[PDB]
Design a protein around this ligand. Structure first.
Ligand code: MG
Length: 218
C-alpha cells in the first residue's frame, strides 16, 4: 500500500486562485486600469509576479520605473495577505477533511507540496495543521512545477520515497511534477485538461481512502 499522500493546496484542498485574482483586480483598480476580469486572469494564473504585472500594465499601455514596478508588486502581495485573512474551515474543498482523517487514522503520511508562500498559515486558518506530517517549504526547493523537486521534498520530509506515495493535483504542471517524482498521480478535473494516461476524478468528493487504495492496487 502507498505510505504517503502529497497534496497541492490550490485546486485540491482549497481555492487560493480567487484571492490572487482579487489582489490583482484591486491593484489594477487602485491605479485606474480596466479589464482585469476572471477571463483575463487566466493569463495571470501560475506565472511570475513580473509577467502578471507586465500584462496588466499593457492593458492601458502604462510605463513604470523599476522603483514603481517593485512598489506595485509589493502592493499586490500586501493585498493578497489581507484578502486571505478571511480563510476559514468553510473554505476546505468537499471530501478533503474526511480524507485527511481517514489517512491519519490508517497511519498514512500527509504532506503539502505547494508553491504557496502562505501554506502553513492557510492550513492553520482551515484547522487542518494537525493532520499534516510535513509542509514542503517552496523557499528551499530549486525548481517549481513541472519540475518534481517540491514533491520529492514533501515525500522526503515525511520519511518516504516518492515511489511510495500518491500525489493529488488539478494542474498539468503539477501532474507532470508528480509523474517525474516517481509518485502516482491522481488528478481532479477534466481528462481534456490533464491527460488520458492517469486516473482523474471530476471533483474532490471522489478522493476517498477507498478510491485511492483501488487506484494503487492497479
Ligand atoms: Mg493545484
Amino acid at each position: 500500500m502507498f505510505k504517503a499522500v502529497l497534496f497541492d493546496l490550490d485546486g485540491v484542498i482549497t481555492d487560493t486562485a480567487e484571492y490572487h485574482f482579487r489582489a490583482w483586480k484591486a491593484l489594477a483598480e487602485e491605479i485606474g486600469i480596466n479589464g482585469v476580469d476572471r477571463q483575463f486572469n487566466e493569463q495571470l494564473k501560475g506565472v511570475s509576479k513580473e509577467d502578471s504585472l507586465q500584462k496588466i500594465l499593457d492593458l492601458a499601455d502604462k510605463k513604470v520605473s523599476a522603483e514603481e514596478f517593485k512598489e506595485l508588486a509589493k502592493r499586490k502581495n500586501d493585498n493578497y495577505v489581507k484578502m486571505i485573512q478571511d480563510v476559514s474551515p468553510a473554505d476546505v474543498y468537499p471530501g478533503i477533511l474526511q480524507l485527511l482523517k481517514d489517512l491519519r487514522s490508517n497511519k498514512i503520511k500527509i504532506a503539502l507540496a505547494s508553491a504557496s508562500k502562505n501554506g502553513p498559515f492557510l492550513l492553520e486558518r482551515m484547522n487542518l495543521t494537525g493532520y499534516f506530517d510535513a509542509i514542503a517549504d517552496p523557499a528551499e526547493v530549486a525548481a517549481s512545477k513541472p519540475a518534481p523537486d517540491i514533491f520529492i521534498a514533501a515525500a522526503h520530509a515525511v520519511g518516504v520515497a516518492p515511489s511510495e506515495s500518491i500525489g493529488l493535483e488539478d494542474s498539468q504542471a503539477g501532474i507532470q511534477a508528480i509523474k517525474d517524482s516517481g509518485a502516482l498521480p491522481i488528478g481532479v478535473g477534466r481528462p481534456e485538461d490533464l491527460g488520458d494516461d492517469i486516473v482523474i476524478v471530476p471533483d474532490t468528493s471522489h478522493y476517498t481512502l477507498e478510491f485511492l487504495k483501488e487506484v494503487w492496487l492497479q
